[PDB]
């Protein structure tokens, strides 16, 4: 397995054309604020190919 290739799976809005989103802030999926701390309704936005 080669898992060095990553991709964005969680985002608040669709990218505009030819946009480069490099932000790695933890995505919030619930009312409770995340504040950069992982937990319920706080998912890391990156996922690997493998």
């Amino acid at each position: 397995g080669n898992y060095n290739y990553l991709y964005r799976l969680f985002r608040k809005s669709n990218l505009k054309p030819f946009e480069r989103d490099i932000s790695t802030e933890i995505y919030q999926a619930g009312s409770t604020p995340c504040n950069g701390v992982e937990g319920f309704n706080c998912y890391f936005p990156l996922q690997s190919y493998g």
Partner: nanobody
Amino acid sequence: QVQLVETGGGLVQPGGSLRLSCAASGFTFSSVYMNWVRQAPGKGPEWVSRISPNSGNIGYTDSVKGRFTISRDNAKNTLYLQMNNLKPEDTALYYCAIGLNLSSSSVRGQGTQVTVSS
């Protein structure tokens, strides 16, 4: 481009607890926690151990109870795994993955395979 550079692990004979390092870079590490997870030849991967960012509670399979320990350092931004009473059955790839609650098929690095040599 987040790179989970993992330090190689040489062959270690039984008699001394093995110390292994695994580094991360390219993103804020104090926010999310890191996870140790093992894949052995001839079988699929399985989660080994996890450490919380703030609470710092080490959680790992009871089958590996009393012999695996973790130590995270944000100043150096890396994880260290210590195994005591290492047995041949430990031979596998103890790779690293950015720990999510499920920690299933999440992001991971190449890692290094280590086999205990009698």
